[PDB]
Design a protein around this nucleic acid. Structure first.
Lengths: 25, 185, 117, 161, 123, 144, 385, 59, 27, 56, 118, 186
RNA sequence: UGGAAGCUGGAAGACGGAAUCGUUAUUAAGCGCCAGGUAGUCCUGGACACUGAAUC
RNA sequence: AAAUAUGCAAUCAAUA
């Protein structure tokens, strides 16, 4: 899907409490 | 006109029955108390009402509620020979709702079983029945069986009493207690 | 169940209109309602209790209040006997809950009324 | 004399029918309510404001600072300008309960509520707020998206042929 | 007196109930443009009189009118109390426009006011 | 929050699943209602025509059926000069559930039949404008 | 032109009646309801045994047995029942006189001149008009001093001590200042809220002196007021705070003070109930509008002048009791149901039906009987010219 | 429109700032009610009312 | 006011059948 | 589970009840665009809260 | 073993029921809530109308500290509202309200027995 | 003890699809209560209005092509709740509530049955104070709920607590794929 | 070449020629969020909110 | 100051 939505899901995980990188690698 | 007259007669009979066999303390309190006299009076009144309920010609629904019977008769007559136009055919319901006698009868319907049946099930009563006639039948059968022995004798009478029957023995295939309840009405 | 509730119900299982069945229904819907088994057995039990009033009094004299409390059916028997006869078989007055004085005395003749219009 | 009689009549009326207005304090030659309240709305944000004679402390929702709720100076000025306009900066302590919307919407709702509370405290000073238009309720709502359009007005690029 | 003041408002409520009962029906009750004229109900004059007089209802309404006019004093008193309850105390170029200099004219379907812009084209 | 009651329904409309919003459907009821309407409109008039065809042996058949079923047949005919009117009726086809609600109009029914009336000044399935309810005109169309 | 004016007046009267009768269906719906009721009544009663009995008796020339129609029973008009108009008038007169007794006592304590004669059926309205005429102000500051001089002594006796001890000159000065402020605030070209409140005023230019209204012109003393007042006076009045306002007024006039409060809380509850009842006949509309148009458009008429009767007195007493218990409409009782009476169905009397209804906590049967004078009501109705 | 929806009347209406016109059809009682409403039950300044082209007994 | 929160053990001890009814058979 | 290929929940499609089309079908209606339009315009949905005067 | 007594059957068998409506087997304040649906004739049953629950205050139960802690731990934090010190127990295990009520009563009695075991 | 339970609260929520139907139901309920037989006042419940819900189904305007022409079908619901407290005339209240329903309006009933537990132990007359040897030698408002305001407060607090508990339990137990537990064989 | 993630990244790409499109202020532009397609699947379609201008 | 340790939406005080 869209890169922006993928980043949004990663940010949601971070807010939930999982430290995941935001780099689009 | 005859059907409306029969409905009025039925309402009058219901009022007379209510005054003749009143339920002291309220219907709900009488049901909860489960006194023999209250059950007998309620069953007698219900059976008399059932016997006196008429059979109308223009309706195939034998409504047990005098409010419903009278309202349907009035509606049928209004539709038959009182409606000038669509406005009247729509205002028929407002006309029915604006009648004071129907307003009075609106708050005199029987108590639905679910008001108390779940409460009785939660309490854990198995020798119970929301139907007054059924409760009277159960009590009277128990009394007849007790009288059959009433003639080491108190022990036998208590043994024959319904309350002292083991729950495991109700059905051979389920030798466990507290498995059978009271049938809902 | 949810997946099997999508399309219309069968249109070939709709009841037909038959004059014979209409007449049968018209005749049957006026059928009489007999008296209830509960009331018939109540009359029979009243007769039996009147016949054996002495045995009931002896049993209630022998019994105590705690047994009556623990056996509700005995409360029904006591109420039936009290409405049949004004005698108080029990030695001590009973609590209102176990038995409340109705003030009633007995059934097919008692349960009757007449009027015209 | 006559002034005392007029004051007595006014105080009797206030005591009888407006008990809450008895507790007032002099400031700049006029009386101001000791405590006052107001309400305001903006976008999807609704705010309630209470002002009580204090030292000038602003508390928002569950004891939150003004600069923490509105980090931006323009939002802070939106919130606190009416105090400056009326000259009561620091005279009152402000307590705010706001819900909904965003930073600017909540700031606007709080501004309206504060203006309403100030005019309630001292009605004669609302002229100072009229010109600034503090007592204006902006009821404008977001423009609904339209069918066949990406946004309320945006559309795909139309290709000829 | 104490008892007189105690019963004053109860008796006023009785009067108001009477006025409400009168006003809860049409002016020319029971006259009607239907069954009244098309299905009249002599030997039956004792239970239903086809004859009818309007002076009775006219007098009833004439007596009702001043009573409600007086009951308006209750509204006047309530308004006086409401006005008093908001008393404050001792006394203490060019046009300005917001949201456009002038309202915009729309020749396309407005998403908000569709009920007034439906006839207009959507593009 | 400038327009609360105007937007009252927005939350359920947009940001809630149907299975959790509590909104009650209509398909499972209108499905039976439409078929009831069609069946009644098709069968009622024919039932009335069949009833009124003979119009002389109706009372005799009622008397004989009452004798067969009840054995008395004096409920409708106390004497020779009493007339028993026949009200057209049709079978009830929609499986309504019997409910404890004492005011339910279709819970005390025991005959499995309902009276049918050809007269209704207000048309129930009011279409929009010139549209006619489907299945109303069976005559074949005629082309120019 | 006269026909045009008459039609316009009829329309205005109908609009006034619509205002007075809220929570009511449109006129055509009401007429259709009455038509259906009448046709239903005829269809039901054509087969009644009583109608056939009377027909046979009249045909065969016999007499009607006396013990058939109860004495209070009346003939059906247009096939549906109607209540005793004379009894209703007697009950109205009794209640109006009862209230006018207290109103007249209050007026006398204030020395209101030109009081009306008690026999007048319009006694209450006449007393109110006399009171307001005696206590009137012209809204002009010039007349404030004269008004204070003429009226202040009368109000001094009733006013609480701290205000009564004041002088007339102080009151005159305060009134002058208040009127000047009100005039300034009303001529300051107000637009929003205040503009609507001013526009709501019913036009009065028939050479009528402008009269200060404390219910409307008082709050204009200050230029700016809480918008909640405007919202409540223009959209929906807080009808539930009437008890609070009445208690406030009683506290101002010093009725609460004392070991036994003169007014007490039962009177507050009674005032709240009275306000609720008036809401049924349109108190909210009155609060939201000006009642001058109501007064000027509600039709008038000649006062009744008839002779009472024992049945009329009985009906008036029953109506008073029913109104006291809240069931002011007698058409909803089994007593006035034609079907049961004509078909020989046992029905409960008015007293029997009232016995099975909640009693009035502030007015028992004995209190009703002692406080309502049907004899004087009948005398007033029989009054002529 | 509300009155016509309640009365099951048909036809058309046309209202503007200073005038109104319409052609109404329906049951006789409904037409009489509409006429009464237009004559007496309109919440706007009605200086003149006129009815014309009245017909009855239509199939 | 007739709630019996505790069953009377004496009656069940006196009467065997009620004793058996109150008894819980082993699983 | 091969038999699910034939007797599974996923071999079922939401087809229009009144039209038979197998696309553009909602559970709240179980009917396609034209079926819904005909039902709405015939007046069968007034009882069930349908508000034709609402756009959004 | 290959044959065993199911937990619900065990609960029924070990449950103690009152002798008559005059006997109470709970002895503590509580409120019982259930939902019933009524309306015009209908062909489809109203969903979500078969569950019932009981609510009570631990202070009203009036137990020792250990017993109260055991009750709170057994019922978990989800069934405990600390603002008013209330605790609720639900039963929506069967589609029939009477069956759910009987199960609720049995589980409430078992819960009280386990609390007393503290 | 079934004989001791009291109907603490009965909240009837009328659910309607038409404003006219809801108004008819409300008026019927009012009229039914206005004629209730037995200081004493009719069992007037506490009204509690509930919001309005809506739903949409979106379709094209054309039988083929033209995806940019769309149509919306909007549905509505209304809910209105009336609460009776400390209900003694259970039969009368239930009959009125069920017979008030008009048109297609349905009703959801919320019953609460309360038991007061063991009665408080009665304290006899307290001992009287006597001088010692030294001294010897020397409802009213119409249309309002008649039940007690404190009773209503307690009932409302209990209702709010149970609502919070229900919301917490439902939110915790909610799942999109019911029956799935993490790390279990999927 | 269902979608998501991780390790490595020798894929183009430095605002894009002739030409060409959207847009009326809570609008453009930016940002996230979510009902429905009754398992999974779009950057589509339909909405929601937040920030938020300039120009004749 | 022995108070707090502080980011904001699109539903709900007629009940959080």
């Amino acid at each position: 899907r869209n890169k922006k939505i993928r980043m949004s899901l990663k940010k949601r995980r971070r807010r939930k409490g999982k430290r995941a990188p935001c780099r689009k690698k | 006109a005859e059907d409306l007259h029969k409905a009025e007669i039925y309402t009058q009979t219901t009022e007379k029955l209510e005054k003749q066999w009143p339920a002291a303390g309220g219907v709900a309190k009488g049901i909860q108390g489960d006194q023999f006299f209250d059950v007998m009076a309620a069953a007698v009144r219900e059976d008399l009402q059932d016997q006196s309920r008429p059979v109308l010609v223009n309706e195939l629904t034998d409504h047990e509620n005098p409010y419903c019977m009278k309202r349907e008769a009035l509606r049928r007559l209004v539709l038959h020979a009182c409606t000038r136009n669509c406005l009247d055919e729509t205002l028929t319901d407002t006309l029915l709702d604006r009648r004071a006698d129907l307003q009075r009868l609106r708050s005199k319907a029987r108590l639905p079983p679910e008001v108390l049946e779940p409460l009785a099930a939660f309490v854990g009563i198995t020798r119970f029945s929301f139907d007054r006639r059924a409760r009277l039948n159960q009590k009277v059968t128990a009394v007849q069986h007790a009288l059959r022995q009433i003639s080491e004798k108190v022990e036998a009478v208590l043994s024959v009493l319904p309350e002292n029957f083991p729950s495991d023995a109700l059905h051979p295939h389920h030798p466990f207690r507290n498995h059978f309840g009271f049938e809902s009405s | 169940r949810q997946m099997m509730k999508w399309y219309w119900p069968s249109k070939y299982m709709l009841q037909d209109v038959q004059m014979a069945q209409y007449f049968q229904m018209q005749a049957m819907r006026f059928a009489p309602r007999p008296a209830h088994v509960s009331l018939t057995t109540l009359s029979a039990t009243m007769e039996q209790c009147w016949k054996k009033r002495d045995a009931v009094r002896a049993f209630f004299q022998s019994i105590d209040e705690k047994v009556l409390r623990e056996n509700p059916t005995l409360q029904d028997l006591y109420g039936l006997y009290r409405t049949l006869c004004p005698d108080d078989p029990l030695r001590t007055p009973v609590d209102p809950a176990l038995w409340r004085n109705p003030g009633f005395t007995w059934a097919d003749q008692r349960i009757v009324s007449s009027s015209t219009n | 004399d006559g002034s005392s009689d007029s004051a007595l009549i006014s105080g009797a009326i206030v005591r009888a029918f407006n008990p809450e207005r008895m507790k007032v304090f002099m400031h700049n030659g006029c009386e101001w309510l000791w405590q006052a309240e107001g309400t305001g709305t903006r976008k999807r944000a609704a705010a309630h404001v209470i002002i009580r004679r204090g030292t000038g402390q602003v508390r928002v929702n569950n004891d939150e600072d003004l600069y923490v709720r509105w980090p931006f100076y323009y939002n802070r000025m939106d919130v606190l300008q009416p105090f400056f306009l009326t000259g009561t900066a620091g005279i009152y302590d402000l307590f705010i309960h706001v819900r909904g919307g965003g930073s600017s919407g909540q700031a606007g709702a709080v501004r309206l509520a504060v203006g309403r509370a100030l005019v309630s405290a001292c009605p004669a000073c609302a002229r100072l707020l009229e010109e600034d238009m503090v007592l204006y309720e902006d009821t404008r709502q977001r423009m609904p998206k339209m069918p066949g359009r990406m946004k309320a007005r945006k559309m795909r690029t139309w290709t000829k042929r | 007196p104490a008892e007189r003041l105690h019963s004053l408002f109860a008796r006023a409520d009785v009067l108001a109930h009477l006025l409400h009962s009168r006003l809860a029906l049409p002016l020319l009750y029971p006259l009607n443009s239907g069954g009244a004229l098309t299905n009249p109900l002599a030997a039956l004059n004792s239970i239903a009189t086809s004859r009818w007089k309007r002076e009775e209802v006219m007098s009833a309404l004439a007596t009702v009118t001043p009573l409600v006019l007086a009951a308006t004093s209750v509204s006047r008193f309530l308004k006086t109390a409401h006005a008093l309850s908001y008393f404050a105390g001792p006394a203490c170029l060019g046009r300005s426009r917001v949201h456009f200099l002038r309202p915009q004219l729309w020749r396309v379907l407005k998403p908000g006011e569709e009920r007034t812009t439906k006839h207009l084209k959507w593009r | 929050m400038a327009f609360r009651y105007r937007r009252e329904g927005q939350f359920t409309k947009f940001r809630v699943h149907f299975d959790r919003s509590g909104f009650r459907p209509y398909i499972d009821e209108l499905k039976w209602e439409i078929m009831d309407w069609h069946y009644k409109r098709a069968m009622g008039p024919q039932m009335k025509k069949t009833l009124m065809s003979y119009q002389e042996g109706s009372e005799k058949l009622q008397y004989m059926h009452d004798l067969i079923a009840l054995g008395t047949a004096k409920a409708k005919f106390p004497h020779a000069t009493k007339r028993f009117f026949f009200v057209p009726a049709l079978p009830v086809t929609i499986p309504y559930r019997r409910s404890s609600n004492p005011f339910c109009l279709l819970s005390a029914n025991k005959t499995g039949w309902l009276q049918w009336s050809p007269k209704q000044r207000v048309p129930f399935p009011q279409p929009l404008g010139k549209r006619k309810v489907g299945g109303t005109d069976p005559q074949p169309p005629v082309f120019p | 032109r006269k026909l045009q004016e008459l039609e316009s007046f009829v329309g205005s009267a109908l609009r006034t009646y619509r205002l007075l009768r809220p929570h009511a269906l449109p006129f055509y719906k009401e007429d259709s309801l009455l038509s259906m009721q009448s046709k239903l009544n005829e269809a039901t009663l054509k087969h009644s045994p009583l109608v056939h009995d009377l027909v046979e008796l009249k045909k065969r020339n016999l007499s009607v047995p006396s013990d058939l129609l109860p004495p209070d029973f009346n003939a059906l008009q247009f096939s549906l029942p109607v209540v005793s108009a004379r009894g209703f008038l007697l009950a109205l007169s009794a209640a109006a006189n009862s209230v006018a007794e207290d109103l007249e006592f209050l007026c006398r304590r204030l020395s209101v001149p030109n009081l009306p004669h008690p026999t007048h059926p319009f006694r209450l309205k006449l007393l109110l008009d006399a009171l307001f005429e005696s206590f009137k102000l012209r809204k002009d500051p010039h007349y404030a001093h004269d008004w204070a001089q003429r009226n202040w002594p009368r109000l001094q006796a009733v006013m609480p001590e701290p205000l009564s001890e004041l002088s007339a000159d102080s009151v005159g000065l305060w009134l002058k200042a208040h009127l000047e402020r009100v005039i300034e605030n009303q001529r300051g070209r107000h637009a929003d809220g205040r503009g609507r409140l001013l526009a709501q005023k019913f036009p009065l230019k028939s050479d009528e002196e402008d009269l200060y209204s404390l219910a409307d012109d008082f709050i204009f003393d200050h230029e700016i007021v809480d918008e909640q007042f405007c919202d409540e006076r223009l959209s929906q009045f807080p009808i539930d705070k009437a008890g609070e306002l009445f208690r406030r007024v009683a506290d101002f006039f010093g009725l609460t003070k004392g070991p036994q409060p003169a007014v007490n809380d039962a009177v507050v509850a009674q005032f709240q109930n009275l306000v609720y009842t008036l809401d049924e006949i349109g108190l909210s509309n009155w609060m939201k509008m000006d009642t001058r148009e109501i007064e000027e458009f509600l039709p008038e008429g000649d006062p009744p002048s008839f002779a009472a009767s024992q049945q009329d007195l009985d009906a008036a007493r029953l109506l008073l009791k029913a109104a006291a218990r809240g069931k002011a409409n007698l058409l909803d009782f089994e007593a006035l149901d034609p079907y049961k009476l004509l078909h020989g169905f046992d029905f409960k009397t008015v007293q029997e039906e009232l016995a099975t209804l909640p009693p009035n906590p502030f007015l028992t049967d004995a209190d009703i009987d002692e406080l309502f004078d049907i004899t004087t009501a009948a005398v007033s109705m029989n009054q002529s010219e | 429109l509300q009155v016509g929806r309640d009365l099951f009347l048909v036809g058309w209406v046309k209202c503007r700032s200073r005038f109104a016109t319409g052609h109404i059809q329906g049951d006789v009682h409904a037409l009489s009610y509409m006429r009464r409403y237009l004559e007496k039950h309109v919440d706007e300044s009605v200086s003149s009312v006129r009815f014309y082209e009245e017909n009855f007994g239509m199939p | 006011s007739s709630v019996f929160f505790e069953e009377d053990d004496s009656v069940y001890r006196q009467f065997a059948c009620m004793r058996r009814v109150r008894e819980e058979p082993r699983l | 589970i091969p038999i699910l290929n034939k007797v599974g929940q996923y071999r079922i499609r939401m087809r229009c009840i009144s039209g038979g089309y197998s696309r553009g079908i909602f559970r709240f209606t179980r009917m396609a665009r034209m079926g819904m339009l005909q039902l709405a315009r015939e007046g069968w949905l007034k009882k069930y809260g349908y508000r034709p005067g609402l756009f959004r | 073993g290959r044959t065993f007594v199911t937990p619900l059957t065990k609960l029924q068998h070990q449950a103690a029921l009152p002798r008559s409506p005059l006997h109470a087997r709970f002895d503590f304040p509580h409120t019982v809530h259930y939902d019933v649906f009524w309306g015009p004739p209908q062909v489809e049953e109203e969903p979500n109308k078969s569950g019932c629950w009981v609510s009570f205050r631990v202070a009203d139960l009036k137990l020792s500290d250990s017993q109260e802690q055991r009750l709170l731990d057994i019922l978990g934090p989800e069934r405990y509202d600390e603002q008013t010190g209330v605790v609720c127990l639900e039963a929506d295990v069967f589609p029939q309200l009477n069956h759910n009520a009987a199960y609720l009563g049995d589980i409430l009695q078992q819960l009280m027995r386990e609390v007393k075991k503290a | 003890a079934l004989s001791a339970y009291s109907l603490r609260s009965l909240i009837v929520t009328y659910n309607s699809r038409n404003r006219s139907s809801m108004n008819a139901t409300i008026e019927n309920l009012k009229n039914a209560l206005r004629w209730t037989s037995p200081s004493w006042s009719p069992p007037w419940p506490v009204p509690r209005r509930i919001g309005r819900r809506q739903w949409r189904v979106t379709y094209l305007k054309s039988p083929f092509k033209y995806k940019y022409a769309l149509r919306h079908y909007v549905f509505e619901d209304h809910r209105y709740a009336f609460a009776f407290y400390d209900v003694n005339s259970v039969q009368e209240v239930v009959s009125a509530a069920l017979g008030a329903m008009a048109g297609e309006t349905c009703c959801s009933c919320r019953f609460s049955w309360r038991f007061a537990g063991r009665p408080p132990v009665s304290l006899p007359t307290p001992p009287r104070l006597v001088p010692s040897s030294r001294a010897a030698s020397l409802t009213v408002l119409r249309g309002h709920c008649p039940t007690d305001k404190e009773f209503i407060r307690r009932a409302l607090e209990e209702e709010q607590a149970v609502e919070r508990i229900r919301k917490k339990l439902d939110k915790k137990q909610l799942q999109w794929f019911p029956g799935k537990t993490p790390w279990a064989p999927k």
